[PDB]
Amino acid sequence: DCSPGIWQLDCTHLEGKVILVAVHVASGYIEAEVIPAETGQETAYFLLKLAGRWPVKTVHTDNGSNFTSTTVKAACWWAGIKQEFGIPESMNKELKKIIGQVRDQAETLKTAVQMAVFIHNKKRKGGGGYSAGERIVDIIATDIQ
Amino acid sequence: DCSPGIWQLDCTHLEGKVILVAVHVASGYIEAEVIPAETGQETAYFLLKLAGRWPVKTVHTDNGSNFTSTTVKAACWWAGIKQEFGIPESMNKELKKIIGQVRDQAETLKTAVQMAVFIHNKKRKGGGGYSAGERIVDIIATDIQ
Ligand SMILES: Cc1nc2ccccc2c(-c2ccc3c(c2)CCCO3)c1[C@H](OC(C)(C)C)C(=O)O
Ligand SMILES: Cc1nc2ccccc2c(-c2ccc3c(c2)CCCO3)c1[C@H](OC(C)(C)C)C(=O)O
């Protein structure tokens, strides 16, 4: 029943590095990237990429100060994004769980993260039974037509 | 009439930097990234991200030697991707055109690229009349069901 334009964006920390995690709330679909620094510039750039791919209307975060930089506000201004305050989970544990499971199968954390994203988005969820990757595409397509 | 799992991947050069460009052939939808070096490791990593997001079955390129590294072959092995040889355009000019149009509106090339990707994917194509972003989502969703 969730609006299809709503996304959640946070950062977690692992191995002294920073993982930016975006969740499409309606579907559970995720996108993630290991970023060199937890900064406004990184968040702004990430939001521009996200918005060119999906119809992003509002973004929520669990750390509001993430969104106070002028650099982030410029990215939401240009892409027509607004901040979402009133949201009614949680993938940071679950994605961290998958990362832990595949970690030794890759040299770098960034590679393991993308493996974990792949696994998460492709998993059939019947425990009828689509994956997050299938649900996002259906939700958006139905919302077009 | 194109298969929905087929993607084209190339690199272009601008301002002495490297832009990796992936095109979903059936829709015209694009994803791009400025990469620090034109290397197998960058291509492999990019393919892992791409494959966690879309149902990527085959990838074609205009420079076959792009795909000879062990690092790329490991990424297509792990993600279940095969190379596509027999393909029946062109965005590298068109995307370059949009980049040129917005270039002065951003400090960095990487930012301009993402602006150009956004513009390209959102543009209604009626010259009925959906955008590449709408077409990819419809094509994939219909292919699920
Ligand atoms: C550094 C590195 N070196 C290699 C040398 C030879 C062969 C493969 C690799 C891989 C690799 C590539 C795809 C892949 C996996 C690992 C693990 C399974 C999924 O696919 C990596 C990975 O890094 C890059 C992806 C950036 C190249 C890694 O971090 O381990
Ligand atoms: C370096 C940089 N510094 C800034 C300082 C203050 C305010 C904004 C910026 C922007 C910016 C952010 C979003 C955006 C656009 C530009 C241009 C329109 C689309 O949205 C950038 C851009 O770089 C980052 C996105 C990495 C921060 C840029 O290359 O110009």
Author numbering:
A (entry chain A), B (entry chain A): 55 to 142, 152 to 190, 192 to 209
Question: What's in the article?
Answer:
During the early stage of HIV-1 replication, IN mediates integration of the reverse transcribed viral genome into human chromatin. LEDGF/p75 also binds the IN tetramer through its C-terminal integrase binding domain (IBD) by inserting a small loop into a V-shaped cavity located at the HIV-1 IN CCD dimer interface. ALLINIs bind at the IN catalytic core domain (CCD) dimer interface occupying the principal binding pocket of its cellular cofactor LEDGF/p75. Consequently, ALLINIs inhibit HIV-1 IN interaction with LEDGF/p75 as well as promote aberrant IN multimerization.
To understand the structural basis for the reduced binding affinity of BI-D to H171T IN, we solved the crystal structure of BI-D in complex with H171T CCD dimer and compared it to the complex of inhibitor bound to WT CCD dimer. As expected with the high concentration of BI-D (~5 mM) used in the crystallographic experiments, the inhibitor bound to H171T CCD dimers. Furthermore, the H171T substitution did not detectably affect the inhibitor position within the binding pocket (compare Figure 5A and B). BI-D hydrophobic interactions with IN CCD subunit 2 as well as hydrogen bonding between the inhibitor carboxylic acid, and backbone amides of subunit 1 were fully preserved in both crystal structures. Importantly, though, we observed differential interactions of His171 and Thr171 side chains with the inhibitor. The imidazole group of His171 formed both an electrostatic interaction with the carboxylic acid and a hydrogen bond with the tert-butoxy oxygen of BI-D. However, the side chain of Thr171 which establishes a novel hydrogen bond with the carboxylic acid was unable to form a hydrogen bond with the tert-butoxy moiety of BI-D (compare Figure 5A and B). BI-D binding to H171T IN CCD resulted in a significantly higher Kd of 10.3 μM. We compared the results for both BI-D binding to the H171T IN CCD and its WT counterpart (data not shown), which suggests that the less favorable electrostatic interactions between BI-D and Thr171 primarily contribute to the lower Kd value for the inhibitor binding to the mutant protein. Crystallographic experiments and binding free energy calculations have indicated that Nδ-protonated or doubly protonated forms of the imidazole ring of His171 can engage in both electrostatic interactions with BI-D carboxylic acid as well as hydrogen bonding with the tert-butoxy ether oxygen of the inhibitor. These interactions are compromised by the H171T substitution, with the Thr171 side chain forming a less electrostatically favorable hydrogen bond with the BI-D carboxylic acid and lacking any additional interactions with the tert-butoxy ether oxygen.
